[PDB]
């Protein structure tokens, strides 16, 4: 995909933002779902308001034609929306607009048609009821996994955006549940907590990488996606985070070589919840959230700004991701000592969609039971 490098840069800019704020919180978000929602929104915007959004998603508008940006997203979307999908991704974006705004039909068509997204009209005159309808939409869309997403609305809200994603992947080569046991997780150099720890002896795409001073593990999911886990050497987490680049990730993805390892990887259930006005504001996207907003592609008559924009991402990592029996296979394990590679201290990860190479998720686990 032509927009993948931009999405990768966007992932890292957003990640580094969130990490710079604190190294004591788990991080999990979807560069793809956030960028898709904001590229979609830009269709309703003009001039500086429009350009700030696309530049804040790491597109250099002097270099990449807008049609290519949207064709990029639309290609990515139809990949993630395949009827077959074993990925089982649950994602949506909801726009909630004041009833009695005269809405531009082209915008509503672009949202639904091009971006296969949803737009609703609500009575923002009733703040509590609007919040309920927004939260109900998300709860319904996730058949119950995300509850009470929006906690507050400004009394002057006339436009809110909610973007949700939940993923529980199925490993192509799964862990056996019988092997999951409680183990130490080193939350710092002197402190441990107990966490459920999966383990398997297998042939892995795994390597210890000098440039990143980290172990780098790639594991495939059923459907079209790969999880990449980066385990920094003692004291090297900040180094790892600084050194990550699109080129480097591309190299790992091209490596198919496999070697024996006794892998220990925690079960995880992690969420990330982000105020996108706040977070994207630090990346330069500010006008669309301000009284200045040029949202004339959405409504021509009345003033409009985006008052509320929230992202919530939910990840489960477990042994199989399904109760179904998987395809039986056999990996040939050499008679030699496998390295023991334990994801039992803070680590960073990315999930990549295989067709486009896009960064579906990025995160950091500082403590599995936080």
Residue numbers in the entry: 24 to 393
Question: What does the original paper state about this entry?
Answer:
Serpins are characterized by a metastable native fold consisting of nine α-helices (A–I) and three β-­pleated sheets (A–C).
We have now solved the highest resolution (1.8 Å) crystal structure of α1-antitrypsin. A new 1.8 Å resolution structure of α1-antitrypsin demonstrates structural variability within this site, with associated fluctuations in its upper and lower entrance grooves and ligand-binding characteristics around the innermost stable enclosed hydrophobic recess. The increased detail provides insight into the mechanism of β-sheet A expansion by delineating the hydration of a relatively hydrophobic environment around the highly conserved Trp194 residue, rendering the initial loop insertion site conformationally labile. These data nicely explain findings from previous tryptophan fluorescence studies of conformational change during polymerization. Occupancy of alternative rotameric orientations for Val216 and Ile340 became apparent during refinement. Previous structures of native wild-­type α1-antitrypsin have indicated the presence of zero, one or two waters in this region. Fascinatingly, the intrinsic fluorescence spectrum of α1-antitrypsin reports the formation of both the intermediate and polymer during polymerization by a small blue shift and increased intensity attributable to Trp194.
